[PDB]
Amino acid sequence: LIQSEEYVDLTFKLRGAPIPLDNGYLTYAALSRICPPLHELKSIGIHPIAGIPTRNNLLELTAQSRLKIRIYHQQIPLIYPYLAGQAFHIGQNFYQLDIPDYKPLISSESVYSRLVIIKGFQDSTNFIEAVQRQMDNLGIQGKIELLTRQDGTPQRRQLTINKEGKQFKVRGFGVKISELNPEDSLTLQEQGIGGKRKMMCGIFVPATRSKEEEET
RNA sequence: UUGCUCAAGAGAAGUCAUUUAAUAAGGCCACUGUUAAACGUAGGUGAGUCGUGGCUUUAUGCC
């Protein structure tokens, strides 16, 4: 019920050809090529693109599909002229961004992260204690829950970094976090957890997306 | 047993051979969607994969 200050969500309407469901390095590299200053930013995150799933491991862009960026509201003039109204290419297709809209950061008792990556922690228990430690660093208190598939197993995801000729394997979990209170909820939403924040993973969102991800 | 009792209009046959509805035609010439305005002030979101790889002190974050 508390709208966070100093942090906003820059949302660009996204249109173009269908894209892989694991954009990650693809979208990040495209934006970095379009926006050189995006590479050197620190406290910025790119939202997972919202669109229905299509065949293979691709993702189809709808009219509601939009590129959303979480950024310090004073750092917008560093990337706005490079992104607002410009176009970026994923693979061989051209994608166009229009004038973005600002969305405030709302507090929620239960928050969700579709993907959390911590280096060197692959099992569930070590990952859980690592996220507890990360909460301890930021001084946030809450109960950690892991998103599960239809079989109840904790859900894992993989990030493919196509750096140079070799392709890289970075993997993590998707967690659901509640019992946060609005202040710590906003703190976790801005700060995020884990690494690879610009890599379309590690940021947070309300638990409605948690249930939606649980559905499929 | 009925002005009746019985009783095949039956056999066979190409409507055929040939013919351009053809020669010619501009839907054409003309039109202003003219003239004027303070944004005042308060309307929200749809979804994968499975066990360390180049930096960096395991850390923990970058590609």
Strand B footprint nucleotides (protein C-beta < 7 Å): 44-55, 58-63
* Beta-carbon count within 10 A of A88 CB: 22
* Beta-carbon count within 10 A of A152 CB: 6
Under a CB-based contact definition with an 8 Å cutoff, are residues A24 and A201 in contact?
A: yes
Q: Coil, helix or strand for A135?
A: helix
Under a CB-based contact definition with an 8 Å cutoff, are residues A50 and A65 in contact?
A: yes
Resolution at which this structure was determined, Å: 3.1
- CB of A146 under 7 A from strand B? no
Distance A172 CA to B7 C1' (A): 111
What span, in angstroms and rounded, lies between the C-alpha atoms of A69 and A103? 10
Map tokens 């079989």 to a residue: A151
- Looking at the DSSP bridge assignments, the partners of residue A93 are A90
Q: Coil, helix or strand for A150?
A: coil
What span, in angstroms and rounded, lies between the C-alpha atoms of A197 and A46? 7
- CB of A101 under 7 A from strand B? yes
Residue A28: what are its φ and ψ, rounded to 5°?
-60, -45
- The separation between CA A202 and the C-alpha centre of its own chain, rounded to angstroms, equals 6
Chain A residues 26 to 55 whose Cβ lies within 7 Å of strand B are: 28-29, 39, 48-53
Structure tokens belonging to residue A78: 């560093």
Experimental approach was cryo-EM
The amino acid occupying position A160 is: T
Under a CB-based contact definition with an 8 Å cutoff, are residues A33 and A100 in contact?
A: no
Distance A2 CA to B21 C1' (A): 88
Under a CB-based contact definition with an 8 Å cutoff, are residues A10 and A100 in contact?
A: yes
The amino acid occupying position A139 is: G
- CB of A199 under 7 A from strand B? yes
What span, in angstroms and rounded, lies between the C-alpha atoms of A194 and A201? 9
- DSSP state, A143? E
Q: Which nucleotide is closest to A192, CA to C1'?
A: B61
What span, in angstroms and rounded, lies between the C-alpha atoms of A204 and A154? 18
